[PDB]
Subunit: 589 residues, 3 copies
């Protein structure tokens, strides 16, 4: 509705300080009240004034030179003509973000204590809320959500359903319980944020290309952002923030170096974005400011993500304050991570990080962690660095005294290709370093393509202990002969186990000078302990004078000696074939 | 192209009746031929005149007060500057919908009878159709698609491939057969419908925020709609209706209370929308008007949905006239439903409705119903309401004489967390109330996280009968000891079954004063009938004078007495240990 | 956009207006439109072309613009309209290859040292004109350097620059393949902004393409409607991260290749939320034989509904054999789909049959992994009379040949497959060797099947060549009727490590006091590829008078077994009493 040209923008790609047009600061401020100095860029002055007008701003193709950030409280509405509508910080730029909009957390009355899964909140006095309003429940106590980091504090975003007196009902169930004496409540007050069809060429100075903070349903669509600093796009304390159809590339400056990060956000996500950043193309986390609650129901879909493989870290990120978030239908070059609680990767294609691993874990609070029908590729071998291809604390402190809820690690279907492992390598490692909770494993349905391999599961205990409900390896295709199904220490060894069935038909021939004949079997896979073995004689009835009793003696985790013995010890009177049909498995759960 | 300001709009948020500007109605009608009274809103008159010009309408930021719907026939093109372009019914509003566009159903010739799966339609005379045209085959006979409601009539939308004389080929196979003597055919005649980047604040009076009816490929994008009445967005009899990137919030007025509903629609769906509504955030169904055919190939993807949990109903809806529709990659707070035919939930996260159940059924015609790799949560327990966590007629008439096709209920992978069930609760219930078709269950691969639990399956018959092709429980993680695998009545009990394997190794020591030694085993899970049991002796050969024959006697659904007996009844001559390796399962299909 | 066709003199009223209506001479017309060719050219075309030529973004108001020549550009093309009422319409007099087109450039870079697959470092022979974010193509001009199935399936790929230090260029993702430095030419992709949105092209019968975008980084097509009766509604050629979204594309075809949207030699990007029809392939991938014709990689089709002409006899959803690491996800596909190339997946798709009755067909299999991941499949027909599986891998065509050079894994995981009209001779999946010598592995796992009659799950044949598979697995299937064959397996398939489902039951036998044995026959519900591993145990009786009896099976075969209870020493049983013979059978080799 307004343009920067209407407020005097030039936008020709060259510098135009206000001094080119105004002899005095007072004269410049008569036109641009918030100009700071005559050396400020006319393009910046014009863009900021247009934003300040309160009308949606349309930015025609041009190359706008700015020395300060374009910022707003409340609302920010900017739409360009596409990638040719360029906002470009100059070498003289100062400020935290190229574009920014910041809403408000406004104190609400305190509340009564409330249980997890409730949809009713009792305020101490009349709350200024109506249906559709958004508020944050916030616990200022350090580590109130997770002990892994100080800043992982508890709370969540609620959406008002109805209000009756001091009672406020909400539109979806609470993720967590709150003691009323420990939380402060804030109404999220913000205007309309919609940023579309522009290109930010941020350079090396600003920390963020775009910052949107404490806003309900901001929208970023069809943008291009390049930067060499901390974050291409940073959503902080936003509810239903969406960024869609955008290309974000952050070369980094050697800091946290994020492409798109959702800090203390709830709902929304990224859809159909192509993203590169040095460390984490997409990430979740937050800060330590008021309202720094966990990241929940944030969904990354249909993106392609790349990072700098030499950074050594995972490309797709969640930090340990995430709960109930996922990457879905994403192509992820350079690895992914399980952190926090209740995290899923669904139908993603994921390649390895530099260490050779594909999925790595950290800061596991507990809950369920899932690789759902993913396609996994590694060109390396993480075993020399003590990690699994899917790693849970192999060489790091991940399952600790800060892991306070039972954990379920679920690998369902999909495929895993890893041509360059050794006979020492393992597909999944979990190592306890202080936790005392059940750690359950379901490794199920996946098709595996390897050269050499040592083991499917490697389950270790450095400190702490576990009593799992289950330890399951099942329906795997592509396992080569000789591998170990699960090395399991301590409480993993005594866990209720299900292990794959092996078996076959072994011919034995009786001898007329003996009451028995035996034959050795070496299992194609090594079990964690002696499996449950069946043996049955087929394809012969009387071997002369006796049927014979089929047994196995001994049996072990690695094999068994099959035998056919006359019950009473009489020698067989004929020398003839018999088929010993054997099988082995473990079926405790 | 045109703006309401050009036609005299004010849009400042206050009321401006025509009387402010025109002394008589005649005077006003010179400018606005459609004006009804001098009390009409200038903003309404202006917006309607803008629509009536036939040019695309751009609505600049503004708050436009209207007392009547903005409506059109055939085409409607409205685009604003985003959420600050607000259309607002006043207290005096009269009309059914805030914005609406209605296309036409134009008679085509009758047709010859045609079979399901055909791509060739024979018209009785020359049809006015060319490639790309869309028509509806419509059976006006009540319940011609489904007997569950009279308005579930048969027919479908067809897209013309080629026309040769009176023969019309179509671009995809027919879903159903039609007797030519029973159907009337209608060409869908409509123009361009495109509604984008506006906000409708509908209030309590209009039944619909947006209504689009009988239109080919209408588009709704980047809109925000709030309402407290029947439907935020209602697509009726549309082909390839698509709504994208929109936020829809219907507080409801205590009726059907839908967010987005697709009535009698084919193709299209909802993508990347955040939706709240009191009863069903998204739904499908229809009315009883001409062309009220089944809802097909409508796909809801990448949405977050919420409802009022106190409504007691499911948040994500399909009615019984749905065929071949799905929700995929959606976050669903407040439950989902199987109804109609061939319905799936894929990679969704779903929480419980107030009853404690998560997926509920109604109006099952038959076909295949799938929960594919979904993450399911319930904080409650549906068993006291006689419902499973996944429920098929537990407490309602769902599998009845109106269920006319074989049913397959499939649960594949994913997870289910339900910490608060009792030892009486069951994960899935199916109860017959009059149906006679096969009802097949595949409960396969899911990771389960419970405290107490009674049963995996509960399969009951109040009336009717069934001869299932299969009844399968397999590859489940997380089942606690003592649960029942399936309680199965009548034809469920005699169905070909597959039930999980349990087994173990039990040490027994022979005694020199007996020919046998036994040991009791109680299975971890209770089978629906005595399972198929194997026992083999290992890790010992002769026990003095005899090997011993390993048997089980008795066996039952809940356990077995393992035994080692000398074949000839001679007492064992030595007291030595032996391992009885036992296992059980059911392997009929 | 900045400029409009009106500003350059357009009419856009739907009727023809040759330049001769306004200008008496060609010279006078060219004063206004320098690139007009003749006074008979359309004013709408001259105006639209001039608007594009201005270099400003072009906004096209509602109107119906008549053009007799393509609207084209080099480097950049920015066009946005008011939606489907902004119509660009070739006239009967149209001449040109494409209605709308933008072509970027491939600019030679220095040569590189040999590099391994999986590398992220490239060494240039001399200083390269590259910075971070730049895109280049490694190209091998040698015919069939990626796949032997076609000449034009040449090797190479798109790389995105991470950093440059001296002659060393690091890249943002690992190379898919290895390259001999002496065999490749390297090219920078130089292009500007391409953005086409919110217009309708009514192409007609003349143009080969509705929209062509060639050699461009991140072109964007959004909210467009395209109809045509020729070769390709939308053709992306040698593009990196081409995205078409929210569009309706319909190609009636002219009897040629007849594509809706085709990605030729493209890397990254894909199609999202599109409704597409084309006579042959609604969406396809492939390419041409021009410089830079590299494999199609990381192209993702998502959230689309696709239809084709079923009487064409071909699959609706296409990849050609030069595809690697591509997929369809969350698509409704009427008229079948295909596995070709390497590492291809369909995920959460609903797919119906092509005319032959099959649903997924293969061709030009290089090797790697081919996945149907939780798909819903439906056929109204039966492909067996045409010698093809419902899921087919060379049943009646040359698919697994000397050009299949890498181990193949065919995976069917979960989902459902309904096929009510098969016969007792039909098979769900067929794979047939016609010259390949690599392992061919099958995982058929977890699917719920709904059939009337059926012959077999797998039909594994060898016409020529040979195979030593790592695995052959059938497991966790629901809905198989009695009497089917699990796997017909010939040659090396027959000797592969197999996993086959368990069958079992409890059979009552009563001893006789005048014999030392009692037997009972069992016929398995499914026929195994070879004699299965069988267990038998006696339950629910201890001594039958004087003896327990030893439970065995004799004989056993692929189709059944004779269960037996025999006193060990051949003494007659002394009592006639019941016993339960608990039997089971399966194959458990992998
Ligand atoms: Ca390594
Ligand atoms: Ca309940
Ligand atoms: Ca035995
Ligand atoms: Ca056929
Ligand atoms: Na000042
Ligand atoms: Na100054
Ligand atoms: Na503002
Ligand atoms: Na609301
Ligand atoms: Na911290
Ligand atoms: Na012999
Ligand atoms: Na009147
Ligand atoms: Na068409
Ligand atoms: Na002993
Ligand atoms: Na001329
Ligand atoms: Na860059
Ligand atoms: Na060729
Ligand atoms: Na072929
Ligand atoms: Na008896």
């Amino acid at each position: 509705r307004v343009t920067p040209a209407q407020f005097g923008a030039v936008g020709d790609g060259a510098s135009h300080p206000l001094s080119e047009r105004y002899a005095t600061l007072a004269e410049a401020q008569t036109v641009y009240p918030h100009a700071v100095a005559l050396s400020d860029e006319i393009d910046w002055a014009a863009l900021q004034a247009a934003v300040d007008s309160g009308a949606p701003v349309h930015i025609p193709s041009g190359d706008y030179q700015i020395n300060r950030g374009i910022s707003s409280t409340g609302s920010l509405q900017i739409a360009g003509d596409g990638a040719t509508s360029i906002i470009r910080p100059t070498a003289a730029f100062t400020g935290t973000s190229v574009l920014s909009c910041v809403g408000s957390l406004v104190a609400l009355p305190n509340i009564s204590s409330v249980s997890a899964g409730s949809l009713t909140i009792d305020f101490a006095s009349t709350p200024n809320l109506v249906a559709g309003d958004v508020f944050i429940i916030y616990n200022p106590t350090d580590s109130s959500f997770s002990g892994f980091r100080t800043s992982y504090r508890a709370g969540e975003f609620c959406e008002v359903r109805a209000v009756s007196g001091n009672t406020v009902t909400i539109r979806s169930a609470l993720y967590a319980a709150y003691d009323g004496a420990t939380v402060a409540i804030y109404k999220v007050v913000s205007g309309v944020v919609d940023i579309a069809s522009i290109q930010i060429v941020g350079g090396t100075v600003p920390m963020n290309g775009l910052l949107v903070e404490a806003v309900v349903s901001p929208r970023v669509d069809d943008v291009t952002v390049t930067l060499a600093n901390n974050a291409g796009v940073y959503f902080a304390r936003c509810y239903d923030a969406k960024i869609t159809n955008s290309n974000i590339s952050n070369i980094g400056d050697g800091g946290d170096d994020y492409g798109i990060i959702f800090g203390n956000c709830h709902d929304g996500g990224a859809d159909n974005c192509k993203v590169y950043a040095r460390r984490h193309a997409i990430a979740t986390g937050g800060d330590a400011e008021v309202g720094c609650v966990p990241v929940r129901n944030v969904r990354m879909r249909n993106c392609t993500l790349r990072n700098d493989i030499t950074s050594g870290t995972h490309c797709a990120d969640f930090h340990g304050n995430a709960e109930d978030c996922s990457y879905e239908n994403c192509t992820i070059y350079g690895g992914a991570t399980w952190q926090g609680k209740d995290i899923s990767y669904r139908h993603c294609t994921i390649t390895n990080a530099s260490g050779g691993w594909i999925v790595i874990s950290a800061e596991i609070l507990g809950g369920t962690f899932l690789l759902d029908q993913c396609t996994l590729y590694t060109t390396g071998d993480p075993q020399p660095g003590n990690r699994g291809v899917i790693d849970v604390g192999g060489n790091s402190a991940v399952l600790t005294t800060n892991t306070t809820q039972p954990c379920n690690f679920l690998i369902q279907g999909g495929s895993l290709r890893a041509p360059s492992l050794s006979t020492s390598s393992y597909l999944l490692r979990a190592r306890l370093e202080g936790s005392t909770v059940p750690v359950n494993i379901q490794y199920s349905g996946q098709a595996i393509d390897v050269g050499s391999l040592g083991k499917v599961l490697q389950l270790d205990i450095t400190s702490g202990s576990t009593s799992p409900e289950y330890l399951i390896v099942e329906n795997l295709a592509g396992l080569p002969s000789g591998i170990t199904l699960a090395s399991a220490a301590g409480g993993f060894a005594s866990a209720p186990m299900r292990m794959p069935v092996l078996g076959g038909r072994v011919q034995v021939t009786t001898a007329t000078n003996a009451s028995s004949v035996t034959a050795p079997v070496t299992f194609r896979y090594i079990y964690p302990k002696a499996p449950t073995v069946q043996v049955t004689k087929t394809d012969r009835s009387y071997a002369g004078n006796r049927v014979g009793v089929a047994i196995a003696n001994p049996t072990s985790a690695s094999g068994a000696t099959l035998g056919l013995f006359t019950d009473d010890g009489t020698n067989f009177s004929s020398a003839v074939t018999n088929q010993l049909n054997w099988q082995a498995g473990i079926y405790e759960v």
